[model samples]
Target: SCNNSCQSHSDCASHCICTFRGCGAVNGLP
Candidate 1:
């Protein structure tokens, strides 16, 4: 569901989101 402007990992469908550096971080999964 989450596509863009995602602020945190929780905002992503993959349970991962980018930081200020731009990279996906592990949330519920890696």
Candidate 2:
């Protein structure tokens, strides 16, 4: 089983970061 990183809604991405948080745009804007 894989462990999740983000916990809250703001902790994760809003659109693109759904796949990988580290690979998505910074500041959670994109």
Candidate 3:
């Protein structure tokens, strides 16, 4: 699931990657 909203990848958890939509798993699971 999405951890949180973010402006950048740095704003997300290490396991998550940030995108314009929000922060989701690095593997694209949200």
Best by TM-score: 3
Off by over 4 Å in 1: 1-12, 25-30
What TM-score number comes out for model 2? 0.19
Show where candidate 2 strays beyond 4 Å. Answer: 1-22
- Expressed as tens digits, the lDDT of each residue in 1-30 for candidate 3 is 567779877678766767887787756565
How far is 3's C-alpha from truth in model 3 (Å)? 2.0
Model 3 residue 23 CA deviation (Å) reads 0.3
Give the candidate number with the greatest lDDT: 3
How well does each candidate superpose onto the true structure, as a TM-score?
0.21, 0.19, 0.46
Q: TM-score of model 3 relative to the true fold?
A: 0.46
Error of 1 at 19 (Å): 0.6
RMSD (Cα, Å) of candidate 2? 8.7
Pitting candidate 1 against candidate 3, the one with the higher lDDT is 3
In candidate 2 the C-alpha lDDT for residue 19 amounts to: 42
Using lDDT as the yardstick, the better of models 2 and 3 is: 3
Model 1: per-residue Cα lDDT at residue 22:
40
Candidate 1 structure lDDT: 0.48
